[model samples]
Target: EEIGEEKEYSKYEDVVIEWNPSVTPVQIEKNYEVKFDVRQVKLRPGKEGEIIVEAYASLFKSRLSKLKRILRENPEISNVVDIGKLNYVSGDEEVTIIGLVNSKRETNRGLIFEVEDKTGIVKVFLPKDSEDYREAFKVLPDAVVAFKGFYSKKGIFFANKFYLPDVPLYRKQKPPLEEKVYAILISDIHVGSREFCEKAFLKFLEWLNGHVESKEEEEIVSRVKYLIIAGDVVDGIGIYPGQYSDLVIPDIFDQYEALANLLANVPEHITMFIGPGNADAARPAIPQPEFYKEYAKPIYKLKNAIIISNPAVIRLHGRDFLIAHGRGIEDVVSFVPGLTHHKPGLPMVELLKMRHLAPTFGGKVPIAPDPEDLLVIEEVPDLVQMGHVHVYDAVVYRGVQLVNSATWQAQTEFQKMVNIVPTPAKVPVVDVESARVVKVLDFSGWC
Candidate 1:
């Protein structure tokens, strides 16, 4: 009602109690067209430097193409000349040049930037008094932009306008499907640590056993057919120094067993999709591949669970979800101005606009040596969901559903030291058909 919309269906509690995982385990894919596929990944560290550079070049070219397209929309900067061509032009003529921002520096007199394109490189100077000097601050390394200013014969190109490859003014949203199925999104479970909220998770499982507290919850839970556990499925042995002390289940295999035991309590109707994180059995890099069946043996044995890569694509009732562990958001929050861990949805919007997951290389989140850049947003998904910062956030950006489901662990010693407050035990339950968040269940109290 707050969103000023009529109800899709009347809330009801007409549930029949059913609890038999052995003989009555109901697979979710039997209901609808639940499709799952992990992104193709190749791990070859040889010649990684060359492949990384080539991947970055590809990203820059893609960015330049998109920015130039946006720049062409503005008649004022429609005729953008190449940097190489501008180098030979006379100073008397006005110029419009489009290039990737190689670097940026601030000065008392003005802001200076080194802009580069495949043709050549040039320095663009934006004086403090320029009309768009403030906007120039948005320029980041490798960001493609357009400059409309006078080209001084002395090699300094003065600019007055800047254009970022932003999202389109209008976005076409996918219409809701006919079914009323729902998907539950949760992440950062950290199952092996001493601080793991076993009781709270057990409580959640009990509720999923058709023991919802309210009619509204019943309506949401009864329809829940898909479950997404984003990442950090375990507290891992060597994720940090002296981490061994915090282990209630020290052996990694034992940790998987414990996790599998807890997950077994979930209703058989829900298809649980699990992904590896920095701590899991996969390699310690962004876009971590699926855990090996040998390492995560117990998880694969689950009747209704499927273990996928850290960054995998899943389709539920024809709605696609680009799921990740969200390690990229930390770099975004630290580098991008006016973005914070409190509201992660903003950083997510920026990534979507850029069309790259972990844009900045050699930053907080490490990238894998995939020959092709699988991190690029090749396909726009109906829902983009991740959870690494242990915060809960959900917002609609340009009609795309963005949800950063909260974590399950309580505040950690590291969080206390860094002044990081986590909104643990909060989950986002999204409607599978409409690709909308039907409810944000709060289990922080249980924690």
Candidate 2:
């Protein structure tokens, strides 16, 4: 899902938004409400150390807060203690210390962790025989957890239970809207690459121009009002050392120019939001700001398009959309067991469960050090869109929609070598009102 990683740039505030019009068709704007307004976002400049430390520190506390809140549901863990004060407790007394995991490993004796809090640090030992040792396997580095057990005279804390701050078991679904509308999810277009599926894309444009042959197809197109291209707007320059050989248009600016020419044919009625990915000409970090207008001139000139941040949130018909190019899933695939690039839904679900995108910092993903932990799922989205694995898949958890838009490129030599059989030219259409995927249009034949 990674296209490569630079640059400090300013956020854009020049996008024009119009939601209601007295002269326009009343039906189109009847039940719709725009949620991508600037009021919903608080932007920050990327990769400065203070921002990174502050973000992580904030995340540690937020996660710890959630875990503690969840633990309060159980009578046994209501009285959690700080790591610094644990030193004052009698060695024989039972206590709980909540800290962020600094380092964890297996001792011949058991599983051991050196955890730290703002006040102090301590070693937490989970003996192989302890009931919580099995749960320790699920713990991730830097994750905040509550350890409940007895303090030994040897100055080591032995843990009997482990708790993870996870999504709540129960959720209340947002009510569906009265009128039906849809948003199309597409990503990894890889325009200008030798493998770019231009022909299929042209056919897609034709279909959007009302060239439908079936009633269902026509109905879907008629209701479609939004198009979200998650990331990878271009194949990019110097993404890899030998990348030029794989490109038909080796010039970075020209690649975006061609994409703009292609996207220009889309209907003016459909609002398009374009966000950058790792391969784009923007900062290569998670929560990447919108592509700098200076670099993406052609895309910026489009009439119907709104350039947006990688992790931008937009609401349609009152349903929230959390859109990302999915570079973070690469980290999830690498470290999590049984998850592969072919099936990205598993790792995506992990992000949802963890409630954080790009949880493990300094890994394969290039996460910018931001002033706040913008990756945290502060506002749970009704729909989540991602594409980087070049695979199309969808799942639902706790009434939230999870969809990977896949790619527009056919299989490339690099993908073949890595055994990535990309599901090219597939578009998943979601009904905004119901927050459900009503259709997955495949243009493989055109490809």
Candidate 3:
């Protein structure tokens, strides 16, 4: 195979590429088209209208029904009773009920939660000394959960056990592919930001163009069939206060053009999926539509680039990949104790357990008042790739691979204040067959 033309650089050309080459090399042709499928699970155009009160009601109803079905899959939870029928049940009789958390507060005795179903609302109490109390603390408002306990004469449901609509422990394995292919997951490029690491990113592009130092790298790069950019493609004009001062390219069009030019250098055989985030030129809400074609015209011109919505599910080689910009992690870490911005995989696991992204609406993650809750995790994905916290983390839980991809920009002023040190210039290359990160290609040294 013909590699691209080698070019000379005035600066450092011998910077060692540090990475773990743990994957076995497989034979693949340069022109081979990897069999893959893409399904946009949740994405809709932004609507213009006054959001009626019923929208929220219907949204929660959808969430409750969908999550209820998932929770019921477990044999431990059965005979879920309606909150309104608690009075009919014999006093002190045990029952299982699933409801959305209306509110939660810590009392002197224990933790009190106002849980509500469509039928009615009831108070569930967990003793501070109980074993379930520790796990119950992670619960956030508006999350659907199951409680197994009995109703007391005091009109409170004294909960004995708690359950989240969690993923199944045993995952049905998909058949291995005949050929080995790879997918690269990256995000938070922030192209227009002054802090953008252009040199490191350029080196990444060079690597994609068949520039390899070792036989291992050549084998891995040749089989890379897909590249997914979860979100934050470009730093918008005014995403935050004083953001104008941080922009290297003030014009949004120029920012996207710059990004498109950089991506155009990628091998045409590798399909690129780009999604927008809070920082991009897309709508500033969950379930955001694709980037506006007018502003990001250059991006649309890229033949290999396919614009995707945030929180999209892509099926590659019979495996499902859930890709999101990860604003939900920000919202989750805010209220959930012990969850910080550093390791976003922990919060990503929380979302999987709840079976809903951005469970606590009206918080930090701005949600669209759609008739149906579009952020529910209807199908369990083999891998979940997200990038918003700008930190790189990979966690395997319940046979699911959760990856929080690193950023391409350095830490900004806001991040510095919050003590968020971004892990930039690192790429996570995933083997499609196993849904595991084969190696974390390090380009930070070049930066």
Candidate 4:
């Protein structure tokens, strides 16, 4: 996977990272991985990769690359496979959002991506005198993106927390429970990155493990039935500066193997759905699909997993979901529409209305539609889940659920300097029968 953008600041070689004092103890207990659990401002940043800091001890004596890796190995995180909408947390000092960079400004340090969220905009700073970035936020002011920065009071939420949904509300189902109470939707694991949600993933796993103690009929199986991961399943190479040299597990497949080993024990009854993202390598259908045919096939061979890479059309619990890897959206924003497998559904209302989003882009990746086949005007999806722009966007277009899952990765210097904005990660429950958003979850910056 080619790293998407460049950087500006000199790589913080052995820079000590810790929580900012502004972080509250409750906040620290919440997203302890990135903040202090008490009165502190910076999160200790010595060791990289998915981590959950139990206690703050000096973590930088050795290279972050050599830290011992404990595979919490929970299917909730492993079978999770997608890295969209860091829906785990929306309210944090520094947040990750997705949207087009509305503007760009050159500063003494570098350029900035003026990212916008529905509630407001933010600045992803990048230095100019650095080989770190290429400064590519927007040629099209409407491009969709995902961005991250220290949270500051903007115009969005109680703290400009914006769309991260700073409220507490869960959708109330009608009448009887649908045999099961939850169907989990989580993405943006970015398994190979230094910022993957290690702790939350752990807590989630432990949460699942506790199901062993449940006395309900769906007990173990119903604990977590469907696990859907949208994109960036494996954070690709070169996403940012020094990323290549930043870890012990250096390869994407190596990361995938590590991820699969953890998923090895998922309950056979759980259904896992997967799709790829920009970070995932492209395969060649002409050559018979190496990764999917060989590597991916073996790994997804798990009893519970169903690798839906073609952005397969799916129907779950009576809910119609069009699961595409969302590669086309990148091209749509770039106007190379043909390159991306799907048009991203960003300016979602229009293309979806016309039913030409994916076909509008040209050619095809390993996954392509039959050009010769007469285009069907009625093949519209009720809900579309996409990831790639690293942004999160969800709205209704023609009565359909348009979801752009967010990312766990922070903005690159190049991304920082653009106008692309990011969105707060959100997990919404839609009624399978009604196909309407029944409940929405804002993981308030935990993990």
Candidate 5:
């Protein structure tokens, strides 16, 4: 929230070692492995199995030696982040990846702290029997340690991972370009009315200008070009009764004007795709609507930014992407036809294969037809994504890259009221040359 010169964190500096929780050595040796969390990284490309390895090191002495080897090699441990606790444990279902720093201590710190949407901070302790840990304790109070790991129980997920923001920032490291591709995956911008991060949004347009220039001049550029503004591009001017705190503005027209100005900056060639938010729905109650056509849409006379309405479809990277502002997904997934069998694009894997998820909603969720149905297909997708749900859910469904991107705003009182966990904002770069997601950049929301 503070605008100032940022502090420089040393690569391997020692900081205060915060103790977490207490547990016997046997626990880590056995049950604890089942409990650890790795938030971001995925292991083995697509290997699925009961990943519980029976004693990694057979002989007790060898096992101890192995543990000591790892400790000596990595002398610091980032706070354990993924698995919050034994509570809400569900394998694969709730997979979490925690950040990591090599641990230098033979013993572990037993502290566990829970994190919240406003700001994630918590504590945990790890009790150990190794003397290496006892000696490291003195220096624990002052070490720049981080953790990286993932855990899944039953069907739940938990993850934690450390990030070094300056690691080339993903885009610069992407492979060479291939096709005429431009992608803009923006979620939770909340641009309409007030609540827009005006300064930051301007900076984004300026940044985007450079990207467009590169693409036009054939300077270093991405194959997938334009921009996609997922759902909630604007904070509706008047959605509910007392949503004043929900906005920094008063009228819906003013909201649209602000949005138009911001979008005006994007290069004409680089199409800006967008949709409405729960707030921006001018005549939301009416069925099959477009907020832009109603209240404060991004364009007045259609200057810049292409409006991609909800549940719309477009082709990208030699594939089809059905973009929809998914509402009531929780309920739809529970009873909707085949759609309930899987998540956005991922469940399509099981649907086109075994159980169908499209039928769960009956008439709801578009009820994508069968293999012969326009929405149905014998092949999986390359990518299918949207916003609305402010959480990070990106994975190659079947083979399609499906992403429920995160948000630009902090958790609202309404979100708290609805029990939604605020997730971090993400900038995922799909390098056309590499034909893969080379990096996932992190972004800070409005303080």
Candidate 6:
């Protein structure tokens, strides 16, 4: 009978390991081992109560003063006058001034912006037919910009040109590394969400473990040394209305536990960096600290995992990497016209132009009230990584690579209602020495 034959074949099932002489196991040894150095840019501690007002004032003062210095370097805008002293200057004479945009509005005739400086505030008018009228559209609230023109008798300053505190075009290239080690950038795993792509993620982990189907994949996997997860490690409980129904794991602690269990399959040789996002256990504010040790104890137990802040700066092979959860992108997209979630790189470029992340306060991005504004981009990074948009975009501007990493969660009910299509299971492999994206490996097939 079939049962009797199956009983005899059961012995073969007990054999856990098998060896074949004909099939030789391939051992691929890396020419050079992985090496990296991480440095987190510190943010000042937040204040409380009445100190919050002073904190906001300090924030704007720092932004205005710092950007004013950069704007002064422009040779085109010379003999700058303060808005408070505009009355002393002769009317109709061309003049220049630097100020922060308090608000912007458009009329049938032209565009108007209320610009403020430490001295005073003034209305800058841009004619509809002016060449710089289109440029005014790029301006956003809380942005410090330089406007050149003359003041009118009507108390409004008519602007001729505008300048953004942009980064320099020529960047000093770093020395190349002796070994070609790759870093994988990904985010928004949302491990507890019902839409989480478990199969695709497992396949990605298997690829990291050297289980490859092609020679090219094998070569890339051999050189991969770093794995950076930007944020949103777990789909937290009660993040939104009806979130509980969408969650596979309702408890926050259990969500992280499941995430840790999945991440434990990663190879020991690869160094991992994890940051917190709005959806994580950390406070729902910019410059979020690392995940709490009590809630994410399993993640802390991983020897290869390094917990980093939300907007962390990592130095690898002498090149600096600016990594953030990218909640600012949402705020930027909402304020700036013609910017959409489909192309996140454009908004990222806008942030780089302003030299500050989350420039607009009182918007969607809740910035903590710190004594000093820590979100300013003081130094130009070789590469910038951001997430939370759930769309993948990589663009090069002024020799800096900006990558908006993809997510691992599929479309949810909320996304469906809003008509958002998330591009998941795609990982970008970056070459640290060149700060260039080598390839975007697609694991969407498994999803």
lDDT assessment of candidate 4: 0.44
Best by TM-score: 3
* 10 residues in a row with least lDDT, candidate 4: 27-36
TM-score of each: 0.82, 0.83, 0.88, 0.49, 0.47, 0.87
Which regions of candidate 3 are displaced past 4 Å?
1-51, 128-130
The local distance difference test score of model 6 is 0.79
Please write out the lDDT profile of model 3 over residues 318-383, one tens digit for every residue.
Answer: 788888777788878888778887778889888888878788877887877666777888878889
Residues 52-123 of candidate 6 have per-residue lDDT tens digits of: 788778877987887888777666668888889999999989999889998889899988899888899899
lDDT per residue for candidate 4 within 1-447, as digits (tens), equals 344444332211232223223222211111001111111223332563223232211121111111111111112112111123333444464444544345656566556656554445556565444343432422333333333344333423111111110111233443433343345555666766565555444444443344223354124323345667766667676655666644445665667776676555444444677666555654432111123444445456677675554344566554557654555454445543333322344455433532333433233433232212111123445576666666655777546777766665554444557755544344555444555555555443675
Q: Which model is ahead, 2 or 3, in terms of TM-score?
A: 3
Worst window of 10 by summed lDDT in candidate 6: 1-10
Residues 1-447, candidate 2, lDDT per residue (tens digit)? 333323222211222222222123215673334454323666554677766677767656656565445446545566677887886788878888877777878779888899887788899888788775655765566666778889887888977777655555576767756667777888888877778886687778777767777867766677678888888878888777787557677677767777777777777788888888888898866666678777789988999888787677887766778887777788766665667777777788777766677766677877554444566666667888888888888888777878999788888887789787988888888887788898888789977
Model 2 lDDT at residue 216: 73
**Tens-digit per-residue lDDT, 1-447, candidate 1:** 012323232111232345534232233444433343445444344596876777756655655665566557644556668888986677877788877776789998998899888899999888888776755765446556778788887889977776655555565656755556777888898887767786677678766776666777665666677888888888887776777666667677777887777777777677888888878888767666678678789889999987787677787676789888888888778776888888999888877766667777676778655444466665567899988878788888776899998888898899899988988777777877678887777766776
Give candidate 1 regions above 4 Å deviation. Answer: 1-80, 88-98, 127-135
- What is the clash tally of candidate 5? 116
Residue 154, candidate 4: Cα error in Å is 56
Which scores higher on TM-score, 2 or 6? 6
- CA RMSD of each candidate after superposition: 9.4, 6.8, 7.2, 23.6, 22.9, 7.5
Candidate 5 per-residue lDDT, tens place, 1-447, comes to: 223333322211121222112211111110001111112123332232222221211222232233223333333443333334534443333222222222223223332323221123333222343333322232111112232333333322223432211111122332333333435576777754333445455444444444333333233232335566656766764456666544564456665666665566555445556655456653352112355465554364555455544445555433445555555344334433555322354333333232122322223343311111122222233455656566665665334455666666766767679666665456565533333455464545433
On TM-score, the stronger of 1 and 5 is: 1
Comparing 3 and 5 on lDDT, the stronger one: 3
